[PDB]
Design a binder for this molecule. Structure first.
Ligand SMILES: CN[C@@H](C)C(=O)N[C@H](C(=O)N1C[C@H]2C[C@@H]3C[C@@H]3N2C[C@H]1C(=O)N[C@@H]1CCOc2ccccc21)C1CCCCC1
Ligand SMILES: [Zn+2]
Length: 92
């Protein structure tokens, strides 16, 4: 999968075909936060920063996890704002 082909939400959604139903985070929330499914286990990558996330847990919010682990991502900042990212990074 080409990162460029994943710049739009609809394209990212279609990558989740065989996404394990047992994982307690849904494709719609993942795709909204920039992620697409790379086709192994529960591994997803962001189309913009290429950050990879896995081992989704109950109650995870994909935007929070994006800001926790990849705070410099420009798509994250454009969508959620620098204030949000600063707070997740523990700067109040
Ligand atoms: C609990 N919520 C989940 C989303 C979470 O926090 N996952 C963490 C994660 O995805 N991370 C951890 C961070 C730490 C550091 C910033 C780097 N990591 C990114 C990410 C990760 O493990 N990514 C792997 C390794 C790199 O390659 C890929 C490629 C695709 C998908 C995932 C990853 C890890 C996964 C392994 C179990 C423990 C939580
Ligand atoms: Zn990103």
């Amino acid at each position: 999968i080409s990162n460029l082909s994943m710049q739009t939400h609809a394209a990212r959604m279609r990558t989740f075909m065989y996404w394990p139903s047992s994982v307690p985070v849904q494709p719609e929330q993942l795709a909204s936060a920039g992620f697409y499914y790379v086709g192994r286990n529960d591994d997803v990558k962001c189309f913009c920063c290429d950050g990879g996330l896995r081992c989704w847990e109950s109650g995870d919010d994909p935007w929070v996890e994006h800001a926790k682990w990849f705070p410099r991502c420009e798509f994250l900042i454009r969508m959620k704002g620098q204030e949000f990212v600063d707070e997740i990074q523990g700067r109040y």
